[PDB]
Design an enzyme around this catalytic site. Structure first.
Site, PDB file in Angstrom:
ATOM      1  CG  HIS A  41      11.760 -10.047  19.514  1.00  0.00           C
ATOM      2  ND1 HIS A  41      11.016 -10.539  18.464  1.00  0.00           N
ATOM      3  CD2 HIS A  41      11.504  -8.726  19.581  1.00  0.00           C
ATOM      4  CE1 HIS A  41      10.319  -9.539  17.920  1.00  0.00           C
ATOM      5  NE2 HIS A  41      10.613  -8.421  18.588  1.00  0.00           N
ATOM      6  N   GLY A 143       8.409  -1.158  16.277  1.00  0.00           N
ATOM      7  CA  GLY A 143       7.549  -1.017  17.458  1.00  0.00           C
ATOM      8  C   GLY A 143       6.249  -1.770  17.291  1.00  0.00           C
ATOM      9  CB  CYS A 145       7.352  -6.788  17.618  1.00  0.00           C
ATOM     10  SG  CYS A 145       8.489  -6.765  16.221  1.00  0.00           S
TER      11      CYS A 145
END
Lengths: 305, 305
Positions: A41, A143, A145
């Site tokens: 993603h 932030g 991830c």
């Protein structure tokens, strides 16, 4: 003496964290040998996340669209591929701080350490468990991830988790390092509801053994039980059923304390039916289920890495 | 989303841990530039610890009686001195992994991370607070002495604790890195009893602000209070008195949430007088006091190092 929620030392993993930027999206990557692993993603905008077609979105991306920074160290991307829900970015430079490692897919009830990172920089380390509904109860902001979960065995880092999603109920979902989600979760912003958050019975028993080793003994009673009688009680309180495999894993703690596993189950039965009467165990007013039998033996025996 | 007991990343400290052996005693040392810091009780036998004369015991020791190993790296001891309850061993080699650091003496109520070590090898990392009675509720086995506590601010490691003693009640005592004990404790095996373990009121309020930021809001009530009225209640429940300095430190969390500090004190008053009625806050059935205001802002804002 004392029993704490203890994470693995994080240094071997800190040296593997990088920043990955694609267009206007920045998150964390894991740099092992000449590969950077990160959530796919990274290629999405906010609008893309409602209904992303990852194959289609990735066609518009070339090696030079992925910016990878290891602190100030710019790494050059020389190849990219999608594996399930992770991107593998081949870089020109092997990470000189690569530890001995493996990728493991963990079972529900297994614990691990999380190194929470932002923009490729470590923020903090804490202990998690894979819940029976395949969520984790983490601490993750925008932030985070690509932050990873891991265990260490002597010299070897076993990576088991990469952070991808927060659910609307504020619990967390992610993948193994092969990019397969734990449980039924997907990397799109949709209605995904978590199943029952059941208590990890074998972990609660392990923690009661830890309490006895530490002198908290008030909950020991004159009762015993059977696996079938205990399990009728487990079901009522949304506890996982206890199996003979679980009894066998608790063998070493049983031997060390001289308390039979079924006697400890009878102690847990009374705690479930009567509560704690405003008392504490190892500084908790609830039954703690994020310590494994191995976690208790490790903390009670002083194993190093 | 989510709130966890979060330790600082431990890598900068892992690189500083060494093994110190003197005769038949092995514990941990901290290697910064060309100095190794360790507890002076490394020079004692078990019998010595009942009534040690450290000046007399140290006369029988020369530089070559101290064996220092950094993993497999043998470090050569070229000088030694006692500073309060720590030994300073001058070595021939500056630690190439020395981080930017300072020594700080912390106040009761301040939190820090502990890297628990055995034989110079890291075991685990966890969060602690300096209790109002100058003990810490750690997790320390035989061989853990010389393990350190620290905070990190961007690039800078602030060392605040070195582990020396377990009290018979199973709580822990130690020194700053200048070798001065926190509280009245001494490095001899005697009757040392801890004072009242009072609750750190400002930390409990910080954690209730963290709960509101995370959507746990059931404990917010329609009441307010005054500092003097709240403090009558704090005294009854062995809470630290709340000061205007405390109110001022909670200012940013007040501003972020729109909940006045005295309204949050009225919420805490009701929790103390009526209990939690079997409910939980941030997954706890007790009021948690080992998060500072700074700890809550750091975890809720994603500060990195």
């Amino acid at each position: 003496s004392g029993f704490r929620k203890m994470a693995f030392p994080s240094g071997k993993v800190e040296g593997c964290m990088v920043q990955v930027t694609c267009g206007t999206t920045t998150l964390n990557g894991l740099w092992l040998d000449d590969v950077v692993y990160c959530p796919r993603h990274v290629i999405c905008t906010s609008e893309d996340m409602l209904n992303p077609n990852y194959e289609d979105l990735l066609i518009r991306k070339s090696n030079h669209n992925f910016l990878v920074q290891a602190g100030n160290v710019q790494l050059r991307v020389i190849g990219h591929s999608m594996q399930n829900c992770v991107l593998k970015l081949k870089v020109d430079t092997a990470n000189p701080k690569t530890p001995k490692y493996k990728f493991v897919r963990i079972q529900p009830g297994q614990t691990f350490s999380v190194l929470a990172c932002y923009n490729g920089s470590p923020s903090g380390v804490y202990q998690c468990a894979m819940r029976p509904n395949f969520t984790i109860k983490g601490s993750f902001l925008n932030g985070s991830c690509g932050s990873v979960g891991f265990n260490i065995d002597y010299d070897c880092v076993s990576f088991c988790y990469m952070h991808h999603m927060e659910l609307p109920t504020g619990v967390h979902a992610g993948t193994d390092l092969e990019g397969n989600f734990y449980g039924p979760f997907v990397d799109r912003q949709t209605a995904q509801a978590a199943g029952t958050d059941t208590t990890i019975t074998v972990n609660v028993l392990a923690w009661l053994y830890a309490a006895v080793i530490n002198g908290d003994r008030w909950f020991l009673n004159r009762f015993t039980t059977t696996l079938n009688d205990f399990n009728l009680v487990a079901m009522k309180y949304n506890y996982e059923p206890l199996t003979q495999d679980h009894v066998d894993i608790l063998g070493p703690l049983s031997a060390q304390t001289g308390i039979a596993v079924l006697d400890m189950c009878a102690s847990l039965k009374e705690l479930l039916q009567n509560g704690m009467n405003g008392r504490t165990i190892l500084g908790s007013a609830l039954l703690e289920d994020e310590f494994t039998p191995f976690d208790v033996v490790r903390q009670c025996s002083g194993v190093t890495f």
